[PDB]
């Protein structure tokens, strides 16, 4: 299973290579938006990013070794977390703002009701990455971990697939530690940074969960457009 036999540097270059592109929104400063229109920008954008995420996922070592049903499950579980960490990464150098797209850079000022707190949470997460000086090599490892981890928990078969995911996860851990060692961190600084990075995934899971709740809310209000794919993804969480 390739993945298991990749060197840390091979793992990293592979992940870098598979990075999805940064898409544009349909934001237009000369056009008026409502709170609902604004959200439409984000759901529309998310819908388009999903196709690229699927391609990226297939290039994450170990992922293509999984059954099709297990692959869809992982993506159903992880998609919003993955969009969110991508958001937080490209927003790092924009203190107090979230860069949803190159043509859509927002401060916290048309956020509906409660949406603003998630917004603040993403902002907090981004500035957290900024203060740690998160590196791209680290970012891609973290993102691959979300994909494999967020949905892993009868047959085996089933049990057999789980262990393989676990093996891949151990590999990415070795890679992270390898990156840190090369960067000149003491052993203590390595373990601490590794922990700091992984605890952030807890907050990302949280933001994802809250987002899904709002997404279900928007479907019900039936005003902001949601693609057929986003709908299907939403159903998986319900």
């Amino acid at each position: 299973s390739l993945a298991l036999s990749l060197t840390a540097d091979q793992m990293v270059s592979a992940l870098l290579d598979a990075e999805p592109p940064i898409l544009y929104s349909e934001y237009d400063p000369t056009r008026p938006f409502s709170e609902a229109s604004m959200m439409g920008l984000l759901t529309n954008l998310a819908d388009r990013e999903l196709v690229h995420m699927i391609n990226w996922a297939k290039r994450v070592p170990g992922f293509v070794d999984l059954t099709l049903h297990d692959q869809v499950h992982l993506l159903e579980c992880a998609w919003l977390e993955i969009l969110m960490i991508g958001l937080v990464w490209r927003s790092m150098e924009h203190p107090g703002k979230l860069l949803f797209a190159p043509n859509l850079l927002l401060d916290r000022n048309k956020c509906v009701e409660g949406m603003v707190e998630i917004f603040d949470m993403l902002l907090a997460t981004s500035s957290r990455f900024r203060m740690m000086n998160l590196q791209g090599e680290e970012f891609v490892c973290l993102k691959s971990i979300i994909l494999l981890n967020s949905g892993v928990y009868s047959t085996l078969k089933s049990l057999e697939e789980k262990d393989h995911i676990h093996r891949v996860l151990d590999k990415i851990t070795d890679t992270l530690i390898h990156l840190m060692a090369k960067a000149g961190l003491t052993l203590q600084q390595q373990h601490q940074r590794l922990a700091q990075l992984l605890l952030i995934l807890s907050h990302i899971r949280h933001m994802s969960n809250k987002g899904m709740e709002h997404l279900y809310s928007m479907k019900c209000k039936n005003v902001v457009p949601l693609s057929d794919l986003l709908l299907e993804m939403l159903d998986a969480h319900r």
Partner: peptide, 9 residues
């Protein structure tokens, strides 16, 4: 299933 099909492609 949309995601299912996209994954196959």
């Amino acid at each position: 299933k949309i995601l299912h099909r996209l994954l196959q492609d």
